[PDB]
Design an enzyme around this catalytic site. Sequence first.
Site, PDB file in Angstrom:
ATOM      1  N   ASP E  94       0.811  -1.211   0.000  1.00 32.84           N
ATOM      2  CA  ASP E  94       0.000   0.000   0.000  1.00 32.84           C
ATOM      3  C   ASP E  94       0.843   1.258   0.000  1.00 32.84           C
ATOM      4  OD1 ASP E  94      -2.790  -1.024   0.321  1.00 32.84           O
ATOM      5  OD2 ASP E  94      -1.912  -1.928   2.121  1.00 32.84           O
ATOM      6  N   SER E 119       1.904   6.708   1.481  1.00 34.23           N
ATOM      7  CA  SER E 119       0.928   5.764   1.971  1.00 34.23           C
ATOM      8  C   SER E 119      -0.285   5.951   1.104  1.00 34.23           C
ATOM      9  CB  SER E 119       0.546   6.058   3.408  1.00 34.23           C
ATOM     10  OG  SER E 119      -0.641   5.359   3.725  1.00 34.23           O
ATOM     11  N   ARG E 120      -0.719   4.888   0.441  1.00 32.85           N
ATOM     12  CA  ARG E 120      -1.922   4.961  -0.362  1.00 32.85           C
ATOM     13  C   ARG E 120      -3.177   5.054   0.508  1.00 32.85           C
ATOM     14  NH1 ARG E 120      -1.715   2.546  -6.169  1.00 32.85           N
ATOM     15  NH2 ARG E 120      -3.661   1.493  -5.567  1.00 32.85           N
ATOM     16  N   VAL E 121      -3.094   4.616   1.760  1.00 33.21           N
ATOM     17  CA  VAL E 121      -4.221   4.810   2.673  1.00 33.21           C
ATOM     18  C   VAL E 121      -4.349   6.286   3.035  1.00 33.21           C
ATOM     19  CG1 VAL E 121      -5.296   4.210   4.861  1.00 33.21           C
ATOM     20  CG2 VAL E 121      -4.059   2.467   3.528  1.00 33.21           C
TER      21      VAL E 121
END
Lengths: 48, 239, 239, 118, 252, 128, 126, 120, 265
Positions: E94, E119-121
């Site tokens: 992620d 961070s893709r979150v």
Amino acid sequence: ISYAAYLNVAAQAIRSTELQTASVLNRSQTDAFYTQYKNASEPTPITK
Amino acid sequence: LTIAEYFRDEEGQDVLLFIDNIFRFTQAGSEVSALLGRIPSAVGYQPTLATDMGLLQERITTTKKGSVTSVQAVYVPADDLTDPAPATTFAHLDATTVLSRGISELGIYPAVDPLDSKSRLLDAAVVGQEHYDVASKVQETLQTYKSLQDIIAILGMDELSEQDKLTVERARKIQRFLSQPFAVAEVFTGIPGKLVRLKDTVASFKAVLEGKYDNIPEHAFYMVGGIEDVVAKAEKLAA
Amino acid sequence: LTIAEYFRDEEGQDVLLFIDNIFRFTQAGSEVSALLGRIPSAVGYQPTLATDMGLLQERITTTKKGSVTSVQAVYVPADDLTDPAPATTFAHLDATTVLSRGISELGIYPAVDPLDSKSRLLDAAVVGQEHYDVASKVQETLQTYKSLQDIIAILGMDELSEQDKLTVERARKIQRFLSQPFAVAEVFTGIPGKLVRLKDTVASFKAVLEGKYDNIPEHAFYMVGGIEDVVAKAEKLAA
Amino acid sequence: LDAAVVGQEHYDVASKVQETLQTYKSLQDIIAILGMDELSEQDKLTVERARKIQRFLSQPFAVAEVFTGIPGKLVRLKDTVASFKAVLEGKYDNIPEHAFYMVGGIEDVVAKAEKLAA
Amino acid sequence: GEWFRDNGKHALIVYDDLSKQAVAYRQLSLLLRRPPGREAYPGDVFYLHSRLLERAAKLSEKEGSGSLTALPVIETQGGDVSAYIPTNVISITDGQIFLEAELFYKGIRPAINVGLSVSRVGSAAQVKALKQVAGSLKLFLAQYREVAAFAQSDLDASTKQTLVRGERLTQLLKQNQYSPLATEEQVPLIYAGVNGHLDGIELSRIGEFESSFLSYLKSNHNELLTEIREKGELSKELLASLKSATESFVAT
Amino acid sequence: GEWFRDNGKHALIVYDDLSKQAVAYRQLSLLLRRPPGREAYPGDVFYLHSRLLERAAKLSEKEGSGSLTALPVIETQGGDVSAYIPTNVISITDGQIFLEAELFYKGIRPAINVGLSVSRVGSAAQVK
Amino acid sequence: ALKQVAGSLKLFLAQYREVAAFAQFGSDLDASTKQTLVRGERLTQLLKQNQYSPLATEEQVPLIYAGVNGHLDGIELSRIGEFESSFLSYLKSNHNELLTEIREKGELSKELLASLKSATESFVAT
Amino acid sequence: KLQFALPHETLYSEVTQVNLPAKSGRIGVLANHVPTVEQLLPGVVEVMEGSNSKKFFISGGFATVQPDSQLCVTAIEAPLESFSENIKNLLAEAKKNVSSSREAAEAAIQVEVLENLQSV
Amino acid sequence: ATLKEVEMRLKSIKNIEKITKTMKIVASTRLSKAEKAKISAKKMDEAEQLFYKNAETKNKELIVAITSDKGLCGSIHSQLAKAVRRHLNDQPNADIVTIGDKIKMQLLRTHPNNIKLSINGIGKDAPTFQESALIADKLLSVMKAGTYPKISIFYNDPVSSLSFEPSEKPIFNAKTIEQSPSFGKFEIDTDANVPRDLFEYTLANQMLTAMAQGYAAEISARRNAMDNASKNAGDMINRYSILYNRTRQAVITNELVDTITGASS
């Protein structure tokens, strides 16, 4: 002392804390050096 | 190794192990692997490179019985430090002196790459805060210089800013101050070998970093011992 | 794909098919071929890379009943456009839609790059001579604007020719006009969504290109549908 | 290419020609990025001469008549050797490059130069 | 680690490192004479790591809301993220925290490359209080990188300002090993940096700044720290309390 | 195409494109387990093309004077004419019309690169 | 003998190529940087050698001495080839006791060094 | 018409009167002034536009009234008390003690500029 | 050839390109400063110079050449030295004072005996009256400037930001000022040498005027120079990246072949 030099002293006393900006200080400082030349080689470098 | 292990366990005491060159162990492994019926792994090495190395290196350790201080020479193929042999060797070491060609062609010996050499023991909790800090700034000065080496090329030494010029100037000295005449290297130098004490080494570099020796020309730091040797060579050159 | 196929084959619909991500389709084939013992081709891919791609893509097409139109997310390895994976895929792509952080940072939604996104069908014989001519100058205006950004940043807005100080004012508007409020995003935005018919879009931009709306302020182009929504919104930001 | 086989003069001209061609090559990258103005006046000269020599090394082939449009030239060894020797001796620097392109020996260079004046 | 996730608790798992695992898996495959591919890796070496890394998850309510978080480590060779295994893991996870030798010797420790990290979150994973101060920090550094090249005499007002912040904010992110900060310790520091309270303080002193500022906050402003720690947000009142506390300390 | 050449008429043949053919060919060779070479193409990939384009010919008086003319299409990657397959087909044909992607995007279409294009035999056949 | 005359010559040439790297910058130099640039350029030229023409150590030692000790620094670069066979010819006739001493003692006593120092300076003005 | 200029900033380049610290003493150059060339000592300059006047302090230089009635004032440094007491004093004592420390040539000339500016 | 080679060459230029472009914006920035130095010295050029027109002042010679210490600025020093050389035929016995090293280098390759003084470390900040005046003070002293019947200032005149113009202008001594045709159009106080002062002031001033324009001309040339450097540097980057990708792909294929050959048996 030449007339230009005479005028510099007066002009740079007209300088020498604020109103004393960057380009104002940097008009009272010269990085220049002179070197005399003959035959060419030289007569060793000196500040202006 | 088996000899040194016996001294570690049954004479139960400090043993030095010198190995030159551990790379040849992995390389020799390679040479038979193809004949032993193995599909070659990446870069043509054996599929069993790392585990082979494990079983070897893990034996070269200090234990609760006795002590081994090993020093291993590690060849680095084509100068490439990512070739799987030196690559896999690193994780096995507590301290790594990386010798560089760039460094040796400037005539700095030993050619230790000061940024890439590392130690588990460079730690405030081990060498004290002062020793640590001097080393840290030394490394920063040199890295600053390294970054600024391309502005040196295109735009000349003159185009640097105030504090940068000084740092670059302090770097060039520090760079040369890390050179040292080894006793065993005497036929390569003509200069007598010099062995410097650690407390002086810190004391000296700490002082240089504070600029207490900036009016001293570069050639006075090159191939000398402690700080006193610089002071002394700068008067031999003034003479 | 098969699911989409039946809607074309049995309901005669214009279906959409989404593949995210087509590159993972190619790597998967790559992996399976390797597993089956086939000698890998160039850059490690399967030898059957191109027919594998064909056997998917060739099923996506217009028939007499309807059409499957596929929008496929494309990832480019190493950012090497010439890597077999993209190189093969690009041989089937009729067009592109490039969503760019460089667009979304200027607050334009959708974040389409108006110059990076291209079409094979953007051609007079496919869209009509009018449609093409609007789009063409729309594209030529935004280019001249792009190469004028650098002089605006250093010199000043006033250092431009009569026709060029008008066409930056024009592009700046065109640009904000290309954004559109989406219907599905209303749960997140509160702004009701516009679905702008093609005939609208051609006429809307045709009218601005001739300079019918230079009197209109810039904020009347942001998040609006047809030209009738530009006429309407401009009157709110005044009276 | 040995001073014994071709004689010292031929050898020497060949060497000085290669030197000059090599200097230019060593500079291709500086010339490519920063252009001619960044070079020392020494190099500026060696480059300008190298650029002439390079062209002078071209030759209309009789069999290639359909692509040059110019009748082929065969040049003799001694005439070749004397020609380049002279370009090295800075006796033709005041002459345009294009005059050196696709001609025979030195006498055609002067010919093309005088023709291209008008 | 899955035992925890499965019983409504939360585990963190660190695989140090998946380069070396890949290498082991390759050893067996080559010895079992399975077809080799790129770098002699088996055709199922991606599936080794995806199988594994997909096991980190946040479960739903129905399922006990447990969680496993994965920090795999990968060792690259001279920065090459295009190497076979780096590519596999980078596309499986992620996001990346990306470290660099350059930044390390420069002094920037942790040697995180902000440019190449993500961070893709993203925000959904970040204490609101921090998000509020860190919203901008993402930027003040982004632009700093686009202009960092200019740090070598004739620089106008706007571009010098960005150079002053960047320097300071970079120095703020420097951190001693084995010394993690609490969130309520973090946001004040970043509040000071982000909004310009550090611009005055000279660069070599931002160290002792962070140090004293926290101890001064504990002595005299324990209440704000507590509100940050417990409510996680910043109310308009708190921002004001923080703005005052900071200027107060800066002045001395 | 040859029937027309062989019988006294003239046929034009367009191979769109040979690149994709050579790709199809390498597939079989690999699946057949032929040693991969440069870019994983088999050793005989040159022969594949050469035997083909050799069939394009202009016949003598004694054979009806029939002509087969070939226009093979090759796809370069990022304008690199130095690749294995391009140079192979360049070395079989009697010249090439090179189309520059740089000109094509600019609007200059046909996007013929003049320096890089040559016909090797055409002049003596071009209308006076 | 050759070790003596080639004191730091290998490193000296490294200093030279480091110096000549900074010259490309279109830079004018000082007393230290012009002086070394000049000598290295001459030392380079001195090491050029025709094929099938190996030299004797008693022939080599002098030339290197003449190069490293400053005695070539003010001679036109195109003339360093002619300096070789002329300085050799000169020593073979006039100072043939000097060479015999080198081919047989293989070393340089302070006396030989002074004898060579003078023999070179002598030849500089023809 | 007036042409006042410093090298760094040009100040005037239509005026009813100007007052200059010329050759010997202060002058007032009116609308029609006999052409003259005078050195400007380092002093105070005033420009008129009716009774509107902004004073300037000046490094010294040259003034020339032209045949076509134009004035050309040229000096290095030029507002008065809104620009340039203790600022000048920490430089004025440094001069008297620098005369006794050649270098004494320029340091002595500084003092004649100081006590003149001090009278403003 | 090898990926490792192509990796460093590509990355080297990737820097030169970012370098030259940083020096192209540093130039553009310094150009706002440039017109505040050009215009403000071209106006002091009308006023200072006008006396001499009206007085109708006309006239071993002293040449002062003006450029700078810094390269990467097109043909600034090349063609100015060409204007001085062209002029130098008509009087080879001139005495040369050089302001800037790059111009000193140029004229030292061609007229080394004529050079008697070199002014150094100039190209950095904009020219100031102090440098101007202290150089002037050196000329009057060391060069004995006041005694030459002819003094000339060569400098570059910036017609626009796109091209410049190598120029010349004279400096008249006390004798020549005095004896001018219309010197008695002015009520000059015949007392304390005014021609002397007017000369030594104009010697500094018109030097500054020259430097200030040469400066401006250089900054606008260096910009245009860097602009193409960046253009070529960037165009090379494209061709090398393309080469890289081929060589990367080729390294993967060739390793894969060895491994396949090895397993084949």
